[PDB]
């Protein structure tokens, strides 16, 4: 990045480490978790660190486990200003076939609704934990291989571990 | 009934955070969803906003 | 003292809905089937919301009420149908 | 992690009502149950109280 390092040093990316040896950084290639991001009006990020925008207003499929069906996420999008080019998120629906084949809903507040029922935070069920983070933002945590982020004003995030 | 407890004056309405507030910044709870006091908000087909505690939807 | 026996909690059971199990907790808390729950709790029949924001009130249908079992002041309202 | 947001000084711990308080009146959440800071509390066979935010049970 335009700055020097002595040999033998081990700088570390978020993903893994790399070590200077004979002017050549050696590096591992071991996987590391990806993030699909929603924010702004309609600005999306892929797992593979793509950016784009698609100002569609419908119940689109954000993500899904696709060889088996451990989960599935469904954004719901809405126009969000007088302008036609202003489409922000309202809510997202999550579905866990692993537990009851339940249906979680993240609400434009910090609210959540399981199966139509509003629910206090924390929500320790067996796998999934839903608690506030700053007391202004919800965080789901299914098992260890999944996270979420507040879909109140529409800044949805995920954490998918490399098992997926 | 005419109950007994801790209220605050009629100009002020109760907020979630233990304070009570005038109805200007009093959020909306449409579908339960806690909309901030100014939230413009709509599918293709509906059209909705939070004004003052009430959620004004249309179609 | 041995002559000081107060309430901790009360359990309510509605065979009419899921054969569920509601639990009123020594806070203002409630727990349905082990799950802690925000107030209000509009299910079909039973409504559970605060009253003064310091006291819970269940309302099953129209023929039943409850009162806060936090520090143990439990009350009920049974209409003459019973 | 080392997160960013609204905290209050280390002498003060967060209370449910939007204020944060010292640990003296910081209630206990045993079984979830929100015990007031001084709650003496016991079956025949157990013996339990809330001191300072922690619930001291015995048998």
UniProtKB/Swiss-Prot annotation, chain A:
Coiled coil: none
Transmembrane regions listed in the UniProt entry: none
Domain VWFD span(s) in chain numbering: 34-164
Disulphide-bridged cysteine pairs: 80-88
Superkingdom of the source species: Eukaryota
Protein name as it appears in the record: von Willebrand antigen 2
Organism: Homo sapiens
Gene: VWF
Region of the whole protein represented: 353 to 516 of 2813
Swiss-Prot record, chains B, D:
Protein name, entry field: von Willebrand antigen 2
Top-rank taxon: Eukaryota
Organism: Homo sapiens
């Amino acid at each position: 990045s335009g700055k020097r390092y002595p040999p033998g040093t081990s700088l570390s990316r978020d993903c893994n480490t790399c070590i200077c040896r004979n002017s050549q950084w050696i590096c591992s290639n071991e996987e590391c978790p990806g993030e699909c991001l929603v924010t702004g009006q309609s600005h999306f990020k892929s797992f593979d660190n793509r950016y784009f925008t698609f100002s569609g207003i419908c119940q689109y499929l954000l993500a899904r486990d696709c060889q088996d069906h451990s989960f599935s996420i469904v954004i719901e999008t809405v126009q969000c200003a007088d302008d036609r080019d202003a489409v922000c998120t309202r809510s997202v629906t999550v579905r866990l076939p692993g537990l009851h084949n339940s249906l979680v809903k993240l609400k434009h507040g910090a609210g959540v609704a399981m199966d139509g029922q509003d629910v206090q935070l924390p929500l320790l069920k067996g796998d999934l934990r839903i608690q506030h983070t700053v007391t202004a933002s919800v965080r789901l945590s299914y098992g260890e291989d999944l996270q979420m982020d507040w879909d109140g004003r529409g800044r949805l995030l995920v954490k998918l571990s490399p098992v997926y | 009934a005419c109950l007994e407890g801790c209220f605050c004056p009629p100009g002020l309405y109760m907020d979630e955070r233990g304070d009570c507030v005038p109805k200007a910044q009093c959020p909306c709870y449409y579908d339960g969803e806690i909309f901030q006091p100014e939230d413009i908000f709509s599918d293709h087909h509906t059209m909705c906003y939070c004004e003052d505690g009430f959620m004004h939807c249309t179609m």
